[PDB]
UniProtKB/Swiss-Prot annotation, chain B:
Belongs to the herpesviridae glycoprotein B family. Coiled coil: none annotated. The lineage of its organism: Viruses, Duplodnaviria, Heunggongvirae, Peploviricota, Herviviricetes. It comes from Human herpesvirus 2 (strain HG52). It is found in: Virion membrane; Host cell membrane; Host endosome membrane; Host Golgi apparatus membrane. Homotrimer; disulfide-linked. Binds to heparan sulfate proteoglycans. Interacts with gH/gL heterodimer. The chain holds residues 120 to 168 of 904 of the full protein. The gene is gB. This is Envelope glycoprotein B. Glycans are attached at N17. Envelope glycoprotein that forms spikes at the surface of virion envelope. Essential for the initial attachment to heparan sulfate moieties of the host cell surface proteoglycans. Involved in fusion of viral and cellular membranes leading to virus entry into the host cell. Following initial binding to its host receptors, membrane fusion is mediated by the fusion machinery composed at least of gB and the heterodimer gH/gL. May be involved in the fusion between the virion envelope and the outer nuclear membrane during virion egress.
C-alpha cells in the first residue's frame, strides 16, 4: 500500500515451486539457466 | 645317590613405589557456552477483512 510519505507491506505471499523436469534437463543441466517464470500446480490450480 | 642340596629360594618383589599427590581430571567440554541476551522486536500484523 502506497500511502502519503510512507509505504507498507499489506502482504507477502511466499511459495516454493518445483522446477519442471524438462527445465531441469534442457535448461539447468544443459545451459546452466532457469526460466524467469514459475508455472506449477498449487492448491489444485495451475498458477504462473 | 645323594640328596639334592637346598635350592635358592625366590625373593619377594621390591613392591611398587607410589608417589602421593592431588589430582584434577578434566574431560572434553560438550556443554554449550551459555549467556543472557535480550530481543527487541515488533510483531506487525496486517489483517485484510
Ligand atoms: Na643330604
Amino acid at each position: 500500500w502506497f500511502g502519503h510519505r510512507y509505504s507498507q507491506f499489506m502482504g507477502i505471499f511466499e511459495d516454493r515451486a518445483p522446477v519442471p523436469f524438462e527445465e531441469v534437463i534442457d535448461k539447468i543441466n544443459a545451459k546452466g539457466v532457469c526460466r524467469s517464470t514459475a508455472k506449477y500446480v498449487r492448491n489444485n490450480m495451475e498458477t504462473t | 645317590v645323594q640328596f639334592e642340596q637346598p635350592r635358592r629360594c625366590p625373593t619377594r618383589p621390591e613392591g611398587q613405589n607410589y608417589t602421593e599427590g592431588i589430582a584434577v581430571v578434566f574431560k572434553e567440554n560438550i556443554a554449550p557456552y551459555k549467556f543472557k541476551a535480550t530481543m527487541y522486536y515488533k510483531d506487525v500484523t496486517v489483517s485484510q477483512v
